[PDB]
Amino acid sequence: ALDAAYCFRNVQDNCCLRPLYIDFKRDLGWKWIHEPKGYNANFCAGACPYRASKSPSCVSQDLEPLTILYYIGNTPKIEQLSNMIVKSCKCS
After folding, report:
1. Which of 34, 37, 50, 87 has the most Cβ atoms closer than 10 angstroms to its Cβ?
2. 3-state DSSP call for residue 24?
3. Per DSSP, what are the bridge partners of residue 1?
């Protein structure tokens, strides 16, 4: 599929997955997560087949969770945050 393997090896104009790093504090305004401080979210961008109208767009398809560590009070919690990482892209 249009995933990191297929996209990061052959960087081209077509709709494909792109690297992107998100810092929780600067980018999301999030203070509540202890670790990590950010993550490789990726994003989808590129050309899709053209049409006179209603041309498809390069959008995310598959998403994946991110393991996080945060505290409630003094208690640590390890959690899967769902749908944080873009794993592949499609033309929609």
Report:
1. 87
2. helix
3. none
Sort residue 73 into left (φ over 0), alpha (ψ -120 to 50) or beta.
left
Technique that determined the structure: X-ray
The DSSP H or E segment spanning 21 is strand 21-23
Peptide bond preceding 76 in cis form (omega within 30 of 0): no
Residues 91, 19: Cα–Cα separation, whole Å: 18
Both tokens assigned to 30: 């999030």
Resolution (angstroms) stands at 1.8
**Neighbouring residues of 10: CB distance < 8 A, sequence distance ≥ 6:** none
Short-list 33, 38, 42, CA closest to 23: 38
Spatial distance between the Cα atoms of 87 and 40, rounded to a whole number of angstroms: 10
- DSSP H or E segment with residue 27: helix 24-28
